[PDB]
Paper text:
Human [name] is an essential enzyme and multifunctional nuclease with AP-endonuclease, 3′ phosphodiesterase, 3′ to 5′ exonuclease, and RNA cleavage activities. Instead, rAPs are processed by AP-Endonuclease 1 ([name]), a multifunctional enzyme in the base excision repair (BER) pathway. During BER, abasic (AP) sites are first processed by [name], which cleaves 5′ of the abasic site generating 3′ hydroxyl and 5′ deoxyribose phosphate termini. Here, we utilize enzyme kinetics, X-ray crystallography, and molecular dynamics simulations to provide insight into rAP processing by [name].
Author numbering: 43 to 149, 153 to 318
The structure:
């Protein structure tokens, strides 16, 4: 019940070489993640685009080591006004996006950045957690609806890549304890339904599951507590979702289980654009 990520497939089914590498990572504390060597791993992974969620760091406190990534020199940050110490996302890109926007239209929690590139639009998101004891599930349900709507009036323009921490394991294969977590944040019925609606309405494909429909034990998050990470007791909360039009560009969708620094691990997408 431990998992070994298959090797990197850097060739599309029509046989073209991957031209774009996107890495997404919930860092659960950007400053702590940086002190735990996250930027060293990123530099090794060398993505063209790096998305980060749950930064928990205001723009004024962004450590200057981030400017020491000249291969990801264009950096955009979204932080909440009200909340201090919670939320926050970032998008770092080798090339400048044609346009960058923040939020989902009715603002400000610092959860979503939208970067328009030449061939596609990239959304990164830190979806609100339903909370211990489902306290914020009502907020989460309305956010899902708003987000779904926002994304619809977006993929109507160009193909869409949505990455980040969606805070839900879609199906049972997506977590280690399906039956014990049916009323816990991330596996409620309302939350699994919302993910399904996300996929139906936009529409989007789950990159990893498209490529690995039968693969179990593939998680991107483990609670710090107990030793869940060491025992692979975890959840797949972090996704790359794509418009159908992009499936022929899809070379691979990775889970970087070995990379430390957070209670989530990175995920990496390869596309042949």
């Amino acid at each position: 019940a431990l998992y070994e990520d298959p090797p990197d497939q850097k060739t599309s089914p029509s046989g073209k070489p991957a031209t774009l590498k996107i890495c997404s990572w919930n860092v659960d504390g950007l400053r702590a993640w940086i002190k735990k060597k996250g930027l060293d791993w990123v530099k090794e992974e060398a993505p063209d685009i790096l998305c980060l969620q749950e930064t928990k760091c205001s723009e004024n406190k962004l450590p200057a080591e981030l400017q020491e990534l000249p291969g990801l020199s264009h950096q955009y940050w979204s932080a909440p006004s009200d909340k201090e110490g919670y939320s926050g996302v970032g998008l770092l890109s080798r090339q400048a996006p044609l346009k960058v926007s923040y939020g989902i239209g009715d603002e400000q929690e610092g959860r979503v950045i939208v970067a328009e590139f030449d061939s596609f639009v990239l959304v990164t998101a830190y979806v609100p957690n339903a909370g211990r004891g489902l306290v914020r599930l009502e907020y989460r349900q309305r956010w899902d609806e708003a987000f779904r709507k926002f994304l619809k009036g977006l993929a109507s323009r160009k193909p869409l890549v949505l990455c980040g921490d969606l805070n839900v394991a879609h199906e049972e294969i997506d977590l280690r304890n399906p039956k014990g977590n049916k009323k816990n944040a991330g596996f409620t019925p309302q939350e699994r339904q919302g993910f399904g609606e996300l996929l139906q309405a936009v529409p989007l494909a789950d990159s990893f599951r498209h490529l690995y429909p039968n693969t179990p034990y593939a998680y991107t998050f483990w609670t710090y507590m107990m030793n869940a990470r060491s025992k692979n007791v975890g959840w797949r909360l972090d996704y790359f979702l794509l418009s159908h039009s992009l499936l022929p560009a899809l070379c691979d969708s990775k889970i970087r289980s070995k990379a430390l620094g957070s209670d989530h691990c990175p995920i990496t997408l390869y596309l042949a654009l």
